[PDB]
Design a binder for this molecule. Structure first.
Ligand SMILES: C[C@H](C(=O)O)c1ccc(C(=O)c2cccs2)cc1
Length: 581
């Protein structure tokens, strides 16, 4: 097709097309006003029409990028708002996108989205086309790497929830429990995808594909290796393009892969029938979040092929990754109770065992026990979520977050306090989700989500490196990240942060904050206590945070709030230093 833009226009349909365009734009330029973005969509949407009707027209034959980054450059206020971003335009393709992507902001500090059960149905009954378009703008900008097509699906979750209850009697009774749940689902999905792009960008395709083979195997244990290799190829391609901004090609390829899975669902999984009865974006969303299919009764003994087989080694020399992928698919198949990372770790301990036993040794008798050189690999993460869910159930989420903040702040006290507080709080939320689960579901729940939070840390740390040791965890190896982080401990050369009184001076302003905001204030206080007394025990810190918390609550109910803070503040600070000896 000589017009790649026409081709995508006819394939995708105007809405989704324009929808993917707004999102493409809200991601590349994140603090441009909304109707500013809207305009840009039309100017490209319009061009696609001329080609859809006549491909031979000039400029219809050029790359989507060409025809998109061109549109970015022309816009006004791009330099005075985004700065360095404006520099990328002298560049050409392929480097222009390269450069643009660089300047996507993973920590934008734009203000929260407040759920307004009265005041926001104003735009709902007013105009759908700008209430959905708003939300897509509003989420794309706070998540520059969000899975392009999954967003259009969330938007229609947004649409349908006001539907059920905007003029309804008890407004925020039906609504706010929904938008809240949703808010969560966005952040998780954003974290899942950020990790897919983070892996392309740090470790290349080979890492994404092993991850997928592992994960689709667990999901579709009934499919066979060539069904799975097939889907993994198409699916990796789809995410490679999404992470590179080519949303249009990303969505088209996604539709085709949904179409494929649905046509062959009978040899993939019986969990797919429900997905396959749906409209497009629901169908794609549904496939991507499908539950793991039941294991097949005929599952063969792993032992023969990979333990008791007489000749495993020529297979290697000739079939390098191909043979490994086989192991990975067969192991992952019957272990829905392992995290993806644990599986890749085992698969590295086959490409490991197999090098020793076969080459420069006599294979069959020493590797006939390889399956037990994994039980250490398994016991470790099991003990770990054991401890941490014991701790969690014992003390609860806020105090679990507090512990992780302390734990992580000793590991890397050089990291800024907002980041420490974010990872601490994110890790604690994992505890909520993953510890209640049947205890065969919590290792994969926990460690898979741990992968997301850690990757978030690593992305922040990519923006502002402060510790060579973090850098080693984030970049040495994908499969080993969590182990690496578990190994960090307080640097014995660390010099405690010089004590700053201002840093624990509270005022009556903290009384108006919503509670999530009060907690962060406290939890930051907590990181800062650690950064200044890094050797204090978790038990001591708990006491001192107890006292700061009582002091806040007390004074926030005082008549002279501010003279309360004035008079009690400093006493506490002096008394706190002695307590943290
Ligand atoms: C990597 C870090 C560590 O131990 O250094 C860590 C390891 C494991 C966990 C952990 O198991 C959980 C948090 C929430 C539910 S389970 C939390 C943090």
């Amino acid at each position: 097709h000589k017009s790649e833009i026409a081709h995508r226009f006819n394939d995708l349909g105007e809405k989704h097309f324009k929808g993917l365009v707004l999102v493409a734009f809200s991601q590349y330029l994140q603090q441009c006003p909304f109707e500013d973005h809207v305009k840009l969509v039309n100017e490209v949407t319009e061009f696609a029409k001329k080609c859809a009707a006549d491909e031979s027209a000039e400029n219809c034959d050029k790359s989507l990028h060409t025809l998109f980054g061109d549109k970015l450059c022309t816009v006004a206020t791009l330099r005075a708002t985004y700065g360095e971003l404006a520099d990328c335009c002298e560049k050409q393709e392929p480097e222009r996108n390269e450069c643009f992507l660089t300047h996507k902001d993973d920590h934008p500090n734009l203000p929260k989205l407040k759920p307004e059960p009265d005041a926001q149905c104003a735009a709902f009954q007013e105009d759908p086309d700008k209430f959905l378009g708003k939300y897509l703008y509003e989420v794309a900008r706070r998540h520059p790497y969000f899975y392009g097509p999954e967003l259009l699906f969330h938007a229609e979750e947004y649409k349908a929830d006001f539907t059920e209850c905007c003029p309804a009697d008890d407004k925020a009774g039906c609504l706010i429990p929904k938008l809240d749940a949703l808010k969560e689902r966005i952040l998780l999905s954003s974290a899942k995808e950020r990790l897919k792009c983070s892996s392309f960008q740090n470790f290349g395709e080979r890492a994404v594909k092993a991850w997928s083979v592992a994960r689709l195997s667990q999901k579709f244990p009934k499919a066979d290796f060539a069904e799975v290799s097939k889907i993994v190829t198409d699916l990796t391609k789809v995410h490679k393009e999404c992470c590179h901004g080519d949303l249009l090609e990303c969505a088209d390829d996604r539709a085709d892969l949904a179409k494929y899975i649905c046509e062959h669902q009978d040899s993939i999984s019986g969990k797919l029938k429900a997905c396959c009865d749906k409209p497009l974006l629901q169908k794609s969303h549904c496939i991507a979040e499908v539950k793991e299919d039941d294991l097949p009764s005929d599952l063969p003994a792993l032992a023969a092929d990979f333990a008791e087989d007489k000749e495993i080694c020529k297979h290697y020399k000739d079939a390098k990754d191909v043979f490994l992928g086989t192991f990975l698919y067969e192991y992952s198949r019957r272990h829905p109770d392992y995290s993806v990372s644990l599986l890749l770790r085992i698969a590295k301990t086959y490409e490991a065992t197999l090098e020793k036993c076969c080459a420069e040794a006599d294979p069959p008798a020493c590797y006939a026990t390889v399956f037990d050189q994994f039980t250490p690999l398994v016991e470790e993460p099991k003990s770990l979520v054991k401890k941490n869910c014991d701790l969690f159930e014992e003390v609860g989420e806020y105090d679990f977050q507090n512990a992780l903040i302390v734990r992580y702040t000793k590991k890397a006290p050089q990291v800024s306090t907002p980041t420490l507080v974010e990872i601490g709080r994110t890790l604690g939320k994992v505890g909520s989700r993953c510890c209640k689960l049947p205890e065969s579901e919590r290792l994969p729940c926990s460690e898979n989500h741990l992968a997301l939070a850690l990757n978030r840390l690593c992305v922040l740390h990519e923006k502002t490196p402060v510790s060579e040791k973090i850098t080693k965890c984030c970049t040495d190896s994908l499969a080993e990240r969590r182990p690496c982080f578990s190994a960090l401990e307080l640097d014995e050369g660390y010099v405690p942060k010089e004590f700053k009184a201002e840093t624990f001076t509270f005022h009556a302003d903290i009384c108006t904050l919503p509670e999530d905001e009060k907690q962060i204030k406290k939890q930051s206080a907590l990181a800062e206590l650690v950064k200044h007394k890094p050797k204090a025990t978790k038990e001591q810190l708990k006491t001192v945070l107890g006292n700061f918390s009582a002091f806040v609550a007390k004074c926030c109910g005082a008549e002279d709030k501010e003279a309360c803070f004035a008079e009690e503040g400093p006493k506490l600070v002096a008394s706190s230093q002695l307590a943290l000896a």
